[PDB]
Write a protein that binds this ligand. Structure first.
Ligand code: NA
Lengths: 221, 222
């Protein structure tokens, strides 16, 4: 499904208890290409993306950059603090603004309102089961199902309703979109060609219009 | 990298609040092949595998078994209960498999009585989702021998028994089943396994595997 957001994580937090964190929320602004955190850091902070776009990347073999995710407003960047950083977070847009707080403040705050952790537990529960079926999926899903799943994921988080459906301004490179799908840009470009000639989508340079999201859902399984 | 266990979720529970739940823990025993729960069922229970081994499978639309994971003693079977059906079926691998389970109502009233435990059950779920993100990161960078090494290491770390020659892993899986956990063809996985045996890293004993040199699998899994 959809990654962690502040709204989903803080939906059951009463307003007065959420107020207490605002003094401890730091605000940072990043320029294009600037790293918000790096792979393997040990700061143990919780970052909230407020404005802009961020990509979780992964420099590994031969120092080849590997796109893992792109994120938008309201989403938690990376993992919840408790374990070094599994990935690097790079600001896509200039004046990318993130709010963050140290883990000590969060755990003290959760200690003050332990009923909040009960409802956040249902969020990590619902997200870990969704994360598990994503792991089984990449074993048993062909590339059109994986393409349909990425386009649906991007549409639900970046989608703009247009006349013929939902436009998806992903603004990735053809290699990048293929990295999210999980195969070569050759295989993915052909799968996009099939989706287009079936009438399901249209390729708008670095945007994609989804004419028939209901068909992509069925193709996902 | 380890799936959820009772001890990991309940390490921070004071002894008093763990005793209050024993009134509501039901005990069921299953023989080999029996389903503990089925895919698409809507029970809101938390299952704890106490003794035996269990596999999580999902049946596709042409009724072919898809092996997702296998579990051993101490682990939570399937998902943790939540107020929104089960995404998989749990099948007993061993005879007289014993599971303990409690209804979500009992769990949530108990979390309500002791909300402080959910704070630290939150941090294990957080560190556990971090583990899966590391796992998804591997499958794009790992070739077939790396995933085979990691799969055999994962099985060895949970149901492995140290012997003088190394670690005996009585996995009891078919070549098709093991290849589904590795994530590629039965032929491709069998040949990678053969390379491991030819190199002296493992030996294939029926459906048990001795890992002569587990440290070699560690290096290869990177
Ligand atoms: Na693996």
């Amino acid at each position: 499904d959809l990654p962690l957001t502040h709204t989903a994580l803080f939906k059951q937090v009463p307003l007065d208890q959420a107020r207490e964190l605002l003094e401890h929320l730091h605000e940072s602004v990043f320029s294009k290409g600037q790293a918000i955190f790096n792979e393997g850091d040990t700061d143990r902070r919780m970052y909230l993306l407020e404005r802009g776009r961020v990509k979780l990347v992964r420099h590994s073999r031969d120092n080849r950059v590997q796109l893992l995710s792109i994120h938008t407003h309201g989403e938690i960047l990376g993992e919840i603090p408790v374990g070094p950083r599994t990935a690097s977070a790079i600001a896509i847009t200039d004046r990318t603004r993130v709010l963050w707080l140290e883990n000590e403040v969060l755990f003290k705050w959760l200690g003050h309102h332990p009923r909040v952790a009960v409802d956040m537990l249902q969020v990590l529960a619902a997200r870990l089961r969704a994360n598990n079926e994503h792991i089984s999926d990449l074993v048993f899903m062909d590339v059109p199902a994986r393409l349909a799943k990425t386009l649906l994921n991007l549409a639900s988080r970046f989608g703009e309703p247009v006349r013929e459906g939902v436009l998806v301004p992903h603004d990735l490179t053809q290699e990048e979109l293929a990295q999210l799908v999980g195969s070569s840009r050759e295989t993915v470009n052909k799968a996009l060609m099939d989706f287009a000639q079936r009438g399901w989508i249209k390729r708008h340079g670095r945007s994609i219009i989804i004419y028939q999201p209901g068909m992509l859902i069925r193709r996902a399984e």
